[PDB]
């Protein structure tokens, strides 16, 4: 377990833990999911929490979040659901993630970064050189380190 992996868990946790109190509530979970275009009910959010709420206090703490990531990621992402994620980034749905669209989802999520950092990410994934990220490029980027 590296400090960078820990830093990554922390970053992810803090995208949900908006008030920084060390627990993720239904309110906070819902906030993230709404920003990504979904509309779960309060009861549905509670059911999500209950799956990993090992201490039974009704909210997600750091290790319970790690468990959620352990399970609910590397399920076995199929074609269709990878396309769903792409669609989140391709805001206008023209088939090409622009730097501006990438910036927008990241900001909506709660990430804070300069247009410089966004451009860097784009250029990293832009295999064919048009300054944008298409579906194939997006899929390929996720296989790299």
């Amino acid at each position: 377990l590296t400090e960078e992996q820990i830093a990554e868990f922390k970053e992810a946790f803090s995208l949900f833990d908006k008030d920084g109190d060390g627990t993720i509530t239904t309110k906070e979970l819902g906030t993230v999911m709404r920003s990504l275009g979904q509309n779960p009910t309060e009861a549905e959010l509670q059911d999500m929490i209950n799956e990993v709420d090992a201490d039974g206090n009704g909210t997600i703490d750091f290790p319970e979040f790690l468990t959620m990531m352990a399970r609910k990621m590397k399920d076995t992402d199929s074609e269709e659901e990878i396309r769903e994620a792409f669609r989140v980034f391709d805001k206008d749905g023209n088939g090409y993630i622009s730097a501006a669209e990438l910036r927008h989802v990241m900001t909506n999520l709660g990430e804070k970064l300069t247009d410089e950092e966004v451009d860097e990410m784009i250029r990293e994934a832009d295999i064919d050189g048009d300054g944008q990220v298409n579906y194939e490029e997006f899929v390929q980027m996720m296989t790299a380190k």
Binding site: E8, M33, M73, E81, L109, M141
Partner: peptide, 19 residues
């Protein structure tokens, strides 16, 4: 680090949670 992979991960998680 893996900025896009981390964010992708969060988007894929959220998609997975709305089962």
């Amino acid at each position: 680090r893996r900025r896009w992979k981390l964010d992708f991960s969060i988007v894929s998680l959220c998609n997975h949670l709305t089962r």
